[PDB]
RNA sequence: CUCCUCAUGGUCAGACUAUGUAGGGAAUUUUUGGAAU
């Protein structure tokens, strides 16, 4: 079985974006690491609010609980 | 380690707790439970016009943040649990020293 | 919390409603049983006599000492 | 052994941002659930992202009967719950 | 303004003196004293060896703290003597600030001579091990006759009550002494240092006692190494084992070193085993080795302790790698890597580039700019590129050049006697030809973070990777440019056998030259 | 287990009222109460926050969704006074 | 009369397109094929699409890991 | 972990009300320790008038954490 | 301080109760938030 954890491991070292449940924020950046409870670490991160670029944040930590989904970009 | 222990250290301290609902609390911590349930005395409380209350017990999950006095010694309070863990963990040639 | 036993206490709920009753018992989850408990909403206005009630610990915000035990 | 593995996973995981914050004494900015932000230095952290923050500057946005205005205040000694954390950003 | 606080105290006429200082700064202080600029000088205990002639001396406190003891302990009367030699007049003046309990001890043994005694009774295990290894003492009779030469012997006769020998007489001495040496021998045979068999009596030496006695490591340290070290052990475990030793009794701690060790542990690559004690000097040794591998900015207090540790470790780490060889585990590779790390000061995986003297982050990046991986590519580089990479002072450039020169590109070749005829359980001699780039003028090893001087050496290694079995090893000092060395090594069991030879330097990292070959044994 | 869980198990067979996180009130006879506060209820009269009232035969609501219960006063005697 | 994890497993084998109702959000629902799942009901979903109901439009998202906490109601289309 | 006693509700048509003021009707099929439910002949009752047959025989799964309450249509 | 787990000593026919250098109180029914506007 291909589990979310292996898919995410293969997703490490790749450009990703993460849509939070609020949808008030999306984060596009390289996926540095993810822990067993699925917190997210991104680098060179960019914030897209309402689909528009808000700004370039950089090395960023995303609380697991806020993540709606992650997709590869 | 566990920051809740750091809160346990905070008895008899005057603090202002902001809460998730936005409520502001001002009072002297009598104790905090490990749940981070905080019991305080001589509390002025402002819901989002202050109410003065002898004792207030707050459920830990409702606590947004607690603002501590600037006089507090964080260097001293933070390092405890590691020392406690070390204490829990704890031939001829003995005297390198002589006469 | 054990000192508060049998006292008349005021509990503030998650929704902002105010319940007042005698605290007979608690538990780990902070589920409280309140004897002769009444509800106040706005502050007396909109006061209702509920009677014996359990309250969930997930809903409870805070409790304060209202009056002495019966 | 179990303790070792937990500390290590913490070190190489996403947690490395707040670990790096404590060791370098660098400022980080935390977007919270109250729609308030906390830029401060990380004195202590926890698995729950409970934090002791020093030199806190919190910034927020308020609306009035005219143009939106930003408001901010300084809190030198601040302790923070772990659930209010939406995001912890580390930057230059 | 080196010694970051030495400025403000010295500016008002009180100087600071302690070991580990910037030497220039220390010298300035001393000069002020001699010229009279500073009338007062505060010297820490360990600097009694630096003898600054004084008109008067004050000794403040007779009690110094060591963590290992877990309480303050008063100074040696020896230290106080070295502390009173400094002052002479118009009249020699010595103030000694002491307790009431220590008053009668210092007031007597300073004015009246020091009664001298002998502590051999503690080290007898190690000493007798050494004698047996040198094979001067063939039997127990031989050892007793050897104990006839001891200052201990004379002492036990004049003052038998001090050593616990109740009978005072020629027969009593003889009996007590033979008891002591007998106990010693039981510890050694139980610990596999020697073996004793009846035919006067015959005593023989094993591989453990050989190395232990040769390097001079104490009996107890060796026994600890034996108990902990097994197969499939990791590098962390090896490092712990290294940290637990009796040689580190002489590394001092007052309360701050230990608390600061706790604070430092956040920043370190490894984590001390949970079932031993933090206050023990072993934990401190562990963290200071961590701070040696990662170059932290250490307090000048800890620099001295690091230096002491380094003065001890090289024999100890040699013993660690060799004892694993004696137990025939192929994991001695990791011990070798650790020894390299101790000689140099860098990790194996972290970066090979940092090994070259005086490299830091920025300079390493230029190496990534020219896309260099190993050190051998630096040897092929020419002067203009080197000048571009390093802009620095001349002494440092010179040391780097010497590093590059004496670090050989040496090639590993073997010649086997018979590849066709391979018999199981026979002593099979191989002749390995080794050849060096440049023939050395001298073998000096160059490292900044390891102040003491080292001569380079090499280990030749043969073993099979999957079984984690090391078949053969030998140490060589290569003075010539090209040599041949013969490993007499027993062959494995029948069938196909992978045999991988390493040439691993004791000093320099990323020198590992390997050749893999497989033979079919019958 | 919880002492209020123990009381709530005593409340089985009585007529109780339930307020859920939505605010709807269900009054009826409590069939069954699990340890997780999941409750099975009979012959329920329901009052919505809008004020509309309905009748239903068998209802079962999750523990987590219950704001609070009101149980009859008979139980107040004992043995929770200790 | 089958456990829900087994139901999700037959979605997995059949590779049917799946519509997930999220939590406290009626406006948008997510759709796509279940290529795998874990014990926390986090789902890797391929050729996923966001479907705002408010004729329906949607955003093609490609491969997605959706967290199980959002899951309200898993379905097939 | 406790298992809800839903066996009395098995193979019965029930109306689940769910978070977000959502309401679905279907025959109870499976459940688990998690209160997660499998419903067959699932019919969504939208806010307006109509109802859609989402899962006739293909059934559906509802997260027990999203289940507000469950009404038994039968006896 | 509280609940659970574990250990334990006791009592009763798994439960209860004292103590503990113990483990714990972030993945669906409670305390590491679906809230925010």
Sequence ranges of the domains in chain F:
1-82
Among G33, G34, G42, the strongest candidate for a mutation testing the A interface, having the largest count of A CBs within 10 A, is G42
Q: Which domains does chain G have, with CATH numbers?
A: 1-77 (2.30.30.100)
For E455, phi then psi, to 5°, come to -95, 140
CB neighbourhood size of H6 (10 A): 19
Q: How far apart are CA F37 and CA G65, in angstroms?
A: 33
Task: Give the helix/strand (H/E) hosting E440.
Answer: none
Q: Would you state the torsion angle of the CA atoms of residues A41, A43, A46, A47, taken in this order, to the nearest 10 degrees?
A: 20
Q: Does H75 touch chain F (CB under 8 A)?
A: yes
Any idea how long chain D is? 92
Q: How far apart are CA D75 and CA B2, in angstroms?
A: 23
At least 3 CB pairs under 8 A between chains B and D: yes
- Domain range summary for chain A, segments of one domain joined by +: 1-73
Q: How far apart are CA G76 and CA D42, in angstroms?
A: 47
Q: How many Å apart are B80 CA and I22 C1'?
A: 18
What is the DSSP secondary-structure string of E469-485? EEEEEEEE---SSEEEE
Q: How far apart are CA E517 and CA E503, in angstroms?
A: 14
Q: For the stretch A17-38, what's the b/e string if a residue is b when 16 or more beta carbons lie within 10 angstroms of its beta carbon?
A: bbbbbeeebbbbbebbbbbeeb
**Six-digit token pair at B39?**
């019991």
Q: Would you state the torsion angle of the CA atoms of residues C53, C55, C61, C64, taken in this order, to the nearest 10 degrees?
A: 40
Q: How far apart are CA A43 and CA A35, in angstroms?
A: 15
Residue whose structure tokens are 């003491």: E452
E139 closest CA partner among E212, E67, E197: E197
Q: Does F4 touch chain C (CB under 8 A)?
A: yes
B19 closest CA partner among B63, B51, B56: B63
Q: How far apart are CA C10 and CA B39, in angstroms?
A: 14
Q: How many Å apart are E91 CA and I11 C1'?
A: 84
The topology (CATH level 3) of D1-92 is SH3 type barrels. (2.30.30)
Instruction: Name residues whose C-beta falls within 8 Å of residue G38's C-beta, 6 or more positions apart in sequence.
Output: A3, A4, A5
Instruction: Name residues whose C-beta falls within 8 Å of residue D70's C-beta, 6 or more positions apart in sequence.
Output: D59, D60, D61, D62
Instruction: Name residues whose C-beta falls within 8 Å of residue E398's C-beta, 6 or more positions apart in sequence.
Output: none
Give domain A1-73's CATH architecture.
Roll (2.30)
CB neighbourhood size of C13 (10 A): 17
CB neighbourhood size of G49 (10 A): 19
SS3 of residue C39 by DSSP: strand
**Six-digit token pair at E328?**
């025939």
CB B27 within 8 A of CB B41: yes
Find the residue in F nearest to H64 (Cα).
F62
- Domain range summary for chain C, segments of one domain joined by +: 1-70
Q: Does B88 touch chain E (CB under 8 A)?
A: no
Q: Using the beta-carbon criterion (under 8 Å), do E274 and D3 form an inter-chain contact? A: yes
**Six-digit token pair at H6?**
């839903």
**Six-digit token pair at E462?**
């043969």
The β-bridge relationship of strands C18-25 and D51-62 is: unpaired
**Six-digit token pair at E130?**
């050494």
Q: How far apart are CA E407 and CA F74, in angstroms?
A: 92
Q: How far apart are CA A23 and CA A51, in angstroms?
A: 9
CB neighbourhood size of B12 (10 A): 9
CB neighbourhood size of H4 (10 A): 21
Burial of E73: CB neighbours in 10 Å, binned 0-12, 13-18, 19+:
middle
Q: How far apart are CA C66 and CA C40, in angstroms?
A: 13
From residue E114, give the alpha-carbon distance in Å to each of D12, E81, F82: 59, 10, 76
Q: Using the beta-carbon criterion (under 8 Å), do B57 and C57 form an inter-chain contact? A: no
Q: Does B58 touch chain C (CB under 8 A)?
A: yes
CB C54 within 8 A of CB F8: yes
- List, comma-separated, the residues after which chain B is broken, a break being a C to N distance over 2.5 A; otherwise answer none: 48, 90
Q: How far apart are CA E325 and CA E474, in angstroms?
A: 10
First-last CA distance in chain H: 29
E98 sits in the region (left: phi over 0; alpha: psi -120 to 50; else beta) called: beta
The β-bridge relationship of strands D27-32 and C60-67 is: unpaired
In eight-state DSSP terms, residue E417 is: S
For H46, phi then psi, to 5°, come to -75, 165
Q: How far apart are CA C13 and CA E71, in angstroms?
A: 56
Q: How many Å apart are B50 CA and I1 C1'?
A: 28
Q: Which long-range contacts (C-beta less than 8 Å, at least 24 apart) are formed by H51-56? A: H51/H25, H54/G75, H54/H24, H55/G75, H55/G76, H55/H26
Q: Using the beta-carbon criterion (under 8 Å), do D43 and B78 form an inter-chain contact? A: yes
First-last CA distance in chain G: 20
One CATH from 1.10.3380.10, 3.30.200.190, 3.30.1280.10, 1.20.1250.20 for E206-348: 1.10.3380.10
CB E66 within 8 A of CB E253: yes
Subunits next to H (3 or more Cβ pairs <8 Å) are: F, G
Q: How far apart are CA A61 and CA D31, in angstroms?
A: 10
F7 closest CA partner among F30, F23, F40, F41: F30
CB E97 within 8 A of CB E80: no
Q: Which nucleotide is nearest to B3 if distance is taken from CA to C1'?
A: I32
Q: How far apart are CA E324 and CA E330, in angstroms?
A: 8
H30 closest CA partner among H2, H63, H56: H63
Instruction: Name residues whose C-beta falls within 8 Å of residue D84's C-beta, 6 or more positions apart in sequence.
Output: B20, B64, B65, D32, D33, D34
Burial of A70: CB neighbours in 10 Å, binned 0-12, 13-18, 19+:
buried
Residues 13-52 of G with CB under 8 A from H: 16, 21, 23-26, 41
At least 3 CB pairs under 8 A between chains C and B: yes
Give domain E349-408's CATH architecture.
Orthogonal Bundle (1.10)
Q: How far apart are CA G48 and CA G59, in angstroms?
A: 9
| CA dihedral sign of residues B23, B28, B30, B34 | positive
Q: How far apart are CA E44 and CA E47, in angstroms?
A: 6
B56 closest CA partner among B24, B14, B25: B25
CB C16 within 8 A of CB C63: no
Q: How far apart are CA F59 and CA F28, in angstroms?
A: 10
For A69, phi then psi, to 5°, come to -150, 165
Cis peptide before F79 (omega within 30 of 0): yes
What is the DSSP secondary-structure string of E235-304? HHHHHHHHHSSSGGGG----THHHHHHHHHGGGSS----TTS-SSSHHHHHHHHHHHHHTT----HHHHH
Burial of F70: CB neighbours in 10 Å, binned 0-12, 13-18, 19+:
buried
The β-bridge relationship of strands G73-76 and H60-62 is: antiparallel
CB E213 within 8 A of CB E192: no
The topology (CATH level 3) of E409-522 is Immunoglobulin-like (2.60.40)
Q: Which long-range contacts (C-beta less than 8 Å, at least 24 apart) are formed by E180-189? A: E180/E121, E180/E124, E181/E124, E181/E128, E181/E140, E181/E143, E181/E144, E181/E147, E182/E140, E184/E124, E184/E125, E184/E128, E185/E128, E185/E140, E187/E125, E187/E219, E188/E125, E188/E128, E188/E129, E188/E132, E188/E219
Q: Does H50 touch chain G (CB under 8 A)?
A: no
Q: Which long-range contacts (C-beta less than 8 Å, at least 24 apart) are formed by B86-91? A: B86/E262, B86/E277, B86/E278, B86/E279, B89/E274, B89/E275, B89/E276, B89/E277, B89/E278, B90/E277, B90/E278, B90/E279, B91/E220, B91/E246
Method: cryo-EM
Find the DSSP H helices in E70-215.
Answer: 77-84, 100-111, 120-134, 140-147, 151-158, 160-163, 170-190, 207-215
In eight-state DSSP terms, residue A64 is: G
**Six-digit token pair at E267?**
């920043």
CB E435 within 8 A of CB E410: yes
Residues 8-67 of C with CB under 8 A from F: 13, 15, 24-29, 31-33, 35, 50-56, 58-59
Q: Which domains does chain H have, with CATH numbers?
A: 1-75 (2.30.30.100)
The β-bridge relationship of strands E93-97 and E56-60 is: parallel
CB B56 within 8 A of CB B43: yes
Any idea how long chain C is? 70
Q: How far apart are CA E503 and CA E512, in angstroms?
A: 6
Find the residue in E nearest to D20 (Cα).
E267
E466 closest CA partner among E512, E492, E499: E499
Of H24, H30, H55, the CB nearest to G4: H30
Q: Using the beta-carbon criterion (under 8 Å), do C25 and F5 form an inter-chain contact? A: no
- Domain range summary for chain D, segments of one domain joined by +: 1-92
SS3 of residue E124 by DSSP: helix
Residue whose structure tokens are 């650790």: E338
SS3 of residue D29 by DSSP: strand
For A58, phi then psi, to 5°, come to 95, -150
Q: Does E279 touch chain B (CB under 8 A)?
A: yes
**Six-digit token pair at F27?**
């009054």
Q: How far apart are CA B81 and CA B9, in angstroms?
A: 11
Q: F1-82 maps to which CATH number?
A: 2.30.30.100
Q: Using the beta-carbon criterion (under 8 Å), do F57 and H72 form an inter-chain contact? A: yes
H8 closest CA partner among G6, F59, F13: F59
Angle between helices E219-228 and E235-243 (to 10 degrees): 160
Q: How many Å apart are F2 CA and I15 C1'?
A: 15
Chain B hits for E123, Cβ within 8 Å: 92-93
Q: How far apart are CA E213 and CA E172, in angstroms?
A: 30
CB F71 within 8 A of CB F7: yes
CA angle, E231 then E232 then E233, to 5°: 90
Q: E118-205 maps to which CATH number?
A: 1.10.10.10
Chain C hits for F70, Cβ within 8 Å: 50-53
Cα within 13 Å of Cα(G69), Cβ side = 10
Residues 8-67 of A with CB under 8 A from G: 8, 11, 21, 23, 38, 64-65, 67
Q: How many Å apart are F1 CA and I5 C1'?
A: 13
**Six-digit token pair at B27?**
């009072």
Angle between helices E219-228 and E300-326 (to 10 degrees): 70
Q: How far apart are CA B41 and CA B53, in angstroms?
A: 7
């Amino acid at each position: 079985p291909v589990n979310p954890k292996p898919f995410l491991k293969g997703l490490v070292n790749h450009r990703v974006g993460v849509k939070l449940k609020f949808n008030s924020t999306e984060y596009r950046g390289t996926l540095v690491s993810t822990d067993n409870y699925f917190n997210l670490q991104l680098n060179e991160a960019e914030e897209f609010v309402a689909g528009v670029s808000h700004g370039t944040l950089g090395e960023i930590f995303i609380r697991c609980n806020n993540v709606l989904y992650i997709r590869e970009l | 380690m566990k920051l809740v222990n750091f809160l346990k250290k905070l008895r008899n301290e005057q603090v202002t707790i902001e809460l998730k609902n936005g409520t502001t609390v001002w009072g002297t911590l009598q104790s905090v439970s490990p749940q981070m349930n905080a019991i305080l005395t001589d509390v002025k409380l402002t819901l989002p016009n202050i109410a003065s209350l002898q004792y207030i017990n707050i459920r830990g999950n409702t606590i947004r943040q607690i603002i501590l006095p600037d006089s507090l010694n964080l260097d001293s309070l933070l390092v405890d649990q590691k020392q406690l863990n070390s204490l829990r963990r704890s031939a001829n040639k003995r005297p390198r020293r002589g006469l | 919390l054990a000192n508060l036993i049998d006292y008349k206490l005021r509990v503030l709920t998650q929704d902002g409603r105010v319940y007042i009753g005698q605290l007979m018992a608690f538990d780990k989850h902070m589920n409280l049983v309140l004897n002769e408990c009444i509800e106040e909403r706005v502050p007396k206005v909109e006061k209702r006599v509920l009677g014996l009630t359990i309250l969930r610990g997930e809903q409870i915000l805070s409790t304060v000492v209202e009056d002495k035990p019966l | 052994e179990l303790e070792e593995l937990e500390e290590f996973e913490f070190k190489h995981g996403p947690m490395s941002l707040i670990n790096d914050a404590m060791v370098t004494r660098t400022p980080v900015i935390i977007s919270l659930r109250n729609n308030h932000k906390i830029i401060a230095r990380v004195k202590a952290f926890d698995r729950h992202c409970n934090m002791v923050l020093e030199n806190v500057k919190e910034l927020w946005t308020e609306k009035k009967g005219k143009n939106v205005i930003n408001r901010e205040r300084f809190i030198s000694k601040l302790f923070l719950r772990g659930d209010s954390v939406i995001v912890v950003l580390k930057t230059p | 303004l080196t010694d970051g606080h030495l400025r403000a105290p010295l500016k008002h006429g009180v100087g600071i003196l302690y070991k580990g200082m910037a030497s220039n700064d220390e010298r300035i202080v001393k000069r002020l004293y001699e010229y009279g600029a500073v009338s007062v000088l505060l010297i820490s205990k360990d600097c009694s060896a630096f003898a600054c002639k004084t008109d008067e001396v004050i000794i403040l406190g007779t009690n110094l703290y060591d963590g290992a003891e877990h309480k303050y302990m008063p100074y040696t009367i020896n230290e106080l003597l070295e502390m009173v030699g400094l002052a002479s007049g118009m009249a020699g003046k010595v103030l000694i600030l002491t307790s009431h309990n220590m008053k009668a001890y210092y007031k007597k043994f300073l004015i009246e001579p020091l009664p001298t005694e002998s502590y051999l009774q503690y080290i007898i295990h190690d000493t007798l091990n050494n004698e047996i290894a040198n094979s001067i003492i063939q039997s127990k009779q031989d050892c007793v006759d050897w104990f006839t030469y001891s200052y201990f012997y004379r002492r036990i006769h004049v003052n038998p009550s001090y050593y616990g020998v109740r009978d005072t007489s020629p027969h009593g001495i003889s009996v007590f002494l033979s008891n002591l040496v007998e106990t010693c021998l039981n510890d050694l045979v139980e610990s596999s240092f020697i073996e004793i068999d009846d035919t006067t009596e015959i005593i023989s030496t094993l591989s453990n006692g050989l190395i232990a006695s040769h390097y001079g490591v104490s009996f107890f340290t060796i026994q600890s190494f034996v108990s902990s070290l097994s197969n499939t052990s990791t590098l962390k475990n090896m490092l712990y084992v290294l940290s637990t030793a009796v040689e580190f009794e002489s590394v001092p701690l007052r309360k701050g070193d230990r608390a600061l060790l706790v604070k430092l542990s956040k920043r370190l690559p490894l984590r001390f085993p949970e079932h031993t004690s933090s206050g023990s000097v072993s934990f401190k040794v562990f963290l200071l080795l961590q701070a040696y591998f990662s170059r932290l900015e250490l307090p000048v207090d800890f620099q001295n302790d690091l230096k002491d540790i380094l003065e001890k470790v090289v024999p100890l780490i040699n013993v660690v790698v060799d004892i694993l060889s004696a137990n025939g585990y192929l994991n001695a590779t990791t011990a070798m890597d650790l020894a390299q790390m101790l000689i140099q000061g860098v990790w194996d995986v972290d970066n090979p580039l940092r090994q070259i003297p005086h490299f830091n982050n920025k300079i390493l990046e230029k190496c990534k700019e020219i896309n260099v991986e190993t050190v051998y590519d630096i040897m092929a580089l020419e002067d203009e590129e080197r000048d571009e990479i390093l802009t620095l002072t001349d002494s440092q450039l010179a040391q780097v050049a010497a590093f590059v020169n004496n670090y050989p590109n040496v090639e590993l070749t073997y010649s086997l006697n018979n590849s066709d005829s391979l018999i199981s359980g026979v002593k099979q001699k191989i002749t390995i030809q080794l050849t060096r780039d440049v023939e050395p003028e001298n073998l000096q090893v160059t490292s900044e973070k390891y102040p003491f001087d080292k001569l380079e050496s090499w280990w030749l290694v043969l073993g099979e990777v999957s079984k984690k079995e090391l078949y053969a090893i030998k140490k060589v000092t290569l003075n010539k440019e090209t040599q041949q060395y013969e490993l007499e090594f027993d062959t494995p069991t029948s069938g196909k056998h992978n045999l991988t030879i390493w040439c691993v330097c004791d000093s320099y990292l990323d020198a590992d030259k390997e050749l893999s070959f497989e033979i079919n044994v019958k | 287990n919880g002492i209020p869980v123990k009381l709530l198990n005593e409340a089985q067979g009585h007529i109780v009222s339930l307020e859920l996180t939505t605010g709807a009130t269900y009054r009826g006879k409590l069939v069954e109460s699990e340890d997780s506060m999941n409750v099975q209820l009979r012959d329920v009269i329901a009052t919505e926050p809008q004020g509309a009232v309905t009748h239903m035969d068998q209802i079962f609501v999750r523990g987590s969704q219950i704001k609070f219960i009101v149980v009859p006063d008979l139980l107040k005697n004992a043995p929770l006074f200790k | 009369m089958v456990p829900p994890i087994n139901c999700i497993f037959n979605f997995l084998q059949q590779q049917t397109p799946v519509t997930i109702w999220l939590f406290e959000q009626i406006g948008i629902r997510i759709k796509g094929k279940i290529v795998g799942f874990d014990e926390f009901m986090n789902v890797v979903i391929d050729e996923a699409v966001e479907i705002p109901v408010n004729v329906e439009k949607g955003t093609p998202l490609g491969k997605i890991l959706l967290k199980g906490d959002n899951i309200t109601l898993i379905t097939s289309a | 972990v406790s298992t809800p006693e839903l066996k009395k509700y098995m193979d019965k048509k029930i109306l689940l009300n769910i978070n977000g003021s959502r309401k679905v009707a279907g025959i109870l099929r499976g459940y688990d320790i998690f209160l997660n439910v499998v419903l067959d002949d699932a019919m969504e009752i939208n806010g307006e008038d109509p109802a859609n047959n989402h899962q006739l025989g293909l059934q559906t799964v509802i997260r027990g954490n999203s289940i507000i309450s469950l009404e038994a249509l039968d006896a």
